[PDB]
Amino acid sequence: QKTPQIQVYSRHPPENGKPNILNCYVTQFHPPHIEIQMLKNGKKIPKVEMSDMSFSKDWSFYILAHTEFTPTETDTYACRVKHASMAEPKTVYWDRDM
């Protein structure tokens, strides 16, 4: 069993008030069964799209989720991943920079 790693980052320079796309790239997990949510102020974002799961040269799985978002000075964004390797969902907050 292998723990997912999570990176959260923007498609375009994050400018407050400007529509953009936020990515959550989840890698290195096994087995492939996984649940991924992206959160705005702790609430699931219903417009998240999921790329097809694939795997790397070294057999480890990966998948990319993404969503339209408008970063502002009052909203937080997060990606939350559930996987059998972890007792709790793992939540990683967007650092507001990436």
């Binding site: 292998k2 990176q7 980052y9 923007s10 498609r11 375009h12 320079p13 994050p14 796309i21 990515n23 790239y25 096994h30 087995p31 492939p32 069964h33 799209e49 790329s51 097809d52 799961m53 694939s54 795997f55 057999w59 799985f61 990319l64 993404h66 650092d95 920079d97 990436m98």
Partner: protein, 269 residues
Amino acid sequence: NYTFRCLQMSSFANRSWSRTDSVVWLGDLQTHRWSNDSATISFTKPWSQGKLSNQQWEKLQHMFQVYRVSFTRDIQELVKMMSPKEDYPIEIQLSAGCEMYPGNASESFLHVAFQGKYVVRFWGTSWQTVPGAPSWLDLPIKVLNADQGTSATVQMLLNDTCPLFVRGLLEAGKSDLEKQEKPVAWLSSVPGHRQLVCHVSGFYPKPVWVMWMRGDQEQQGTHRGDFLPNADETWYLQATLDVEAGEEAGLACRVKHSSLGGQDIILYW
């Protein structure tokens, strides 16, 4: 000079639940997907049929449709006959395709992982377990090797079908494979030291050069992160430099990429 990868992912939870999902890549561009709940393979590019007729493509798809069913049945039977006597769950990954080398012969491969570990390959004309695989796996491989029909079909697919199909793909996907997309860069920092970060996104193809600079002097302590995918199949990379308070003044992030035409991005902190 591209590797074409057919990546199959099969999960067997019990005797009454399995799924098989595949994705296909030419280089770092996705050309096909085939999800368990579709009867047919989907094209994820306008050029995914390559240079095949509707008829040739149907026959190739038909072969995979028969395969998906047979593979599912065969794995479950093999497990039922094996050690430690029907051992669900089972995870299998299969990586098959060919590496094109313009001017010469393509090289083909078919590798198989079981419970996340590489165990088996097709080699020449038969299956083989690889050094360090669980020894019991020799038995289902011997069984699989009694199937002459399957061995002839796999040799055809790897030796002939794969490079012929890919050559067509390369020609038909030429404009995407050679597309240039431009990086856009931005700076941030986290804090007496701080880490400056240069974020670079939207470039294609993958090769890039990103350095923190002071005038023309490269800051060789620059650390580049992993390449991370954007949804539109361009790339993202960050490059960080650790600096002391006061050192930031006069540093810049510089990016070179094929798409820029020699006009580097230089962003001064």
